[PDB]
Design a protein around this ligand. Structure first.
Ligand code: NAP
Ligand code: COG
Length: 206
């Protein structure tokens, strides 16, 4: 048991690929947070009482969510840490690597589980993003592009939107995005508190 399912990466980044500053988000986008919640939470109604999505995150990203928004609700949370000394959590799983987390979910949630897994999402940070980028099951990127050069100190590891990667990663039609996400999403740019941003979906053939 290891991988059958595809992986989906979800990120909010500037046109310079900046993803963060001083172990937090250098922007306050309340509607950007609501899209995240929605995307990472959505499960088809037919499958809504048995299934759930999984959110995989690096230990620094875990330390970043307000104590108040931990764990992410209605989703299975898995923290990747080598230094799993003692991860505190009443059913928050810890796994030492990306593949180590996949076999743990595959083990902990099989046919004999009252809880089934729908979608698997990598939600950050930079180091976990580097590992997912290299994983042979990663085929989709949900990106939020922020059209401002906001000073950042952590960058997204692969320039997926750049010409060097244009035969690999392709941006999908907005109707393709809303269908995957199962709901309707804002087309065009969104301005909220001085930042212009937009929602995109990139995919690659495995
Ligand atoms: N803009 C966005 O969408 C977005 C999304 C998420 C996060 N962020 C930001 O990204 C920054 C955090 O990024 P980061 O790179 O510093 O942290 P990160 O990936 O969240 O955390 C790194 C820690 O996670 C574990 N880890 C991650 N990848 C691992 C692997 N392949 N194998 C084993 N352990 C692994 C290790 O834990 P131990 O060292 O405990 O082993 C490593 O020190 C923060 O500024 C956060 O705000 C932005
Ligand atoms: C209540 O939840 C949070 C509140 C504050 C916060 O910041 C410090 C975070 C950090 N965090 C996981 C976050 C936020 C926005 C995101 N947007 C997109 N597109 N992709 C992500 N992987 C993402 C991740 C989470």
């Amino acid at each position: 048991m290891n991988q059958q399912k595809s992986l989906t990466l979800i990120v909010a980044l500037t046109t310079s690929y900046g993803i963060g500053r001083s172990n937090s988000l250098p922007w306050k986008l309340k509607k950007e947070i609501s899209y995240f919640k929605r995307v990472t939470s959505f499960v088809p109604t037919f499958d809504s009482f048995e299934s759930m999505n999984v959110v995989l995150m690096g230990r620094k990203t875990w330390e970043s969510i307000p104590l108040q928004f931990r764990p992410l609700k209605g989703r299975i949370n898995v923290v990747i840490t080598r230094n799993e000394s003692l991860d505190l959590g009443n059913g928050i799983h810890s796994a030492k690597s990306l593949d180590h987390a996949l076999e743990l979910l595959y083990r902990t949630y099989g046919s004999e589980s009252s809880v089934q897994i729908n979608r698997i999402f990598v939600i950050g940070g930079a180091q976990l993003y580097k590992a997912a980028m290299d994983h042979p099951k990663l085929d989709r990127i949900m990106a939020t592009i922020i059209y401002k050069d906001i000073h950042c100190d952590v960058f997204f590891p692969l320039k997926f939107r750049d010409k060097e990667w244009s035969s690999v990663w392709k941006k999908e039609k907005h109707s393709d995005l809303e269908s995957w996400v199962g709901t309707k999403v804002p087309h065009g740019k969104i301005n909220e508190d001085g930042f212009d941003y937009e929602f995109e979906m990139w995919t690659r053939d495995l």
